[model samples]
Target chain A: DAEFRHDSGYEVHHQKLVFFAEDVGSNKGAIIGLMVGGVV
Target chain B: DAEFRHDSGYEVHHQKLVFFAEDVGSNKGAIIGLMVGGVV
Candidate 1:
């Protein structure tokens, strides 16, 4: 059983973006955010 | 109107992910792609 799933395939996650290099209280670079997920 | 083509605007698109940073020589990040389009 490869991780049984009555729905054949469920419990998953997707859509993620991460960017962090500077911005320590006012560093530089920039900020990024946006994500989508699904779990069951 | 939305730059009418035939008679009005009915073409639209969605789904897209884009990100850009630095350190591309073999490290952090560089180029990314993921776009959806629709025309009708």
Candidate 2:
């Protein structure tokens, strides 16, 4: 969490958040992903 | 979500989200809402 000191916030809302990510072959590649969850 | 005094934020492990909404029959009652998406 401290790697990137990115501090931000947002207003309340109704939604199903899915936070997800993946690494293909190289450090970064074209791949499909989806949201898993929300931090709030 | 404005009538209610709920406003906060958090640092997430991932970077994705979804938001959803719903409307009950009664207006003076608690609503079971879902996050279909995120503003961030």
Candidate 3:
């Protein structure tokens, strides 16, 4: 529900975004991420 | 020139964004950031 704090308050597109991040391994060898976009 | 890994490869708007962060003090008690955007 936010953007980069400026740009005259115009949002790019998605009104809402949810992000998820998970460690691919216990040793943190790689990080995986997911993004979901929609409006509530 | 990049967005999240998905949304079917669609970008929200700003094609490019540059960010800078400053540690503000000896404690890192506060962080200050700046964002600049443009197309290249």
Candidate 4:
């Protein structure tokens, strides 16, 4: 049960979603790099 | 207005918190790297 609650010492109702393109497939590495870059 | 709601197509009540160690300052980069790694 990975539930979060109001008193969890973190912001409430915040969320994130990440989507990547796998069509061309050649840019997988670069895409992952960008994802990691944005997260940092 | 950063509130998230049930119809946001994301999980409810899920949250995250990140903390880094800036002491000594040398490992700041490494600490941030770890935090990012955990998030993804």
Model 4 TM-score? Answer: 0.20
Write candidate 2's Cα lDDT for A1-40 as tens digits: 1232333575333444443322122222222234233212
lDDT of 4 by residue, B1-40 (tens): 2543333333457645444312221211212322222222
By lDDT rank, best first, the candidates go 4, 2, 3, 1
Which segments of candidate 1 are over 4 A away from where they belong?
A1-5, A12-24, A31-40, B1-40
Docking class of 4: incorrect
- Calculate DockQ per candidate and list them: 0.03, 0.06, 0.04, 0.07
Q: lDDT tens digits, residues A1-40, model 3?
A: 3333223334465344333232222221212232122101
Q: TM-score of model 1 relative to the true fold?
A: 0.15
lDDT preference between candidates 1 and 3, better one: 3
lDDT of 2 by residue, B1-40 (tens): 1232323485344444533422222322212234222211
Model 1 over residues B1-40: C-alpha lDDT tens digits?
Answer: 1332232233223323544333222222212232222000
Model 2 in CAPRI terms: which quality?
incorrect
For model 3 chain B, the run of ten residues with the poorest summed lDDT: B31-40
For residue A5, give model 1's deviation from the true position in Å. 8.5
Model 4 clash pairs?
none
lDDT of 4 by residue, A1-40 (tens): 3443233334346655433322321211112332332322
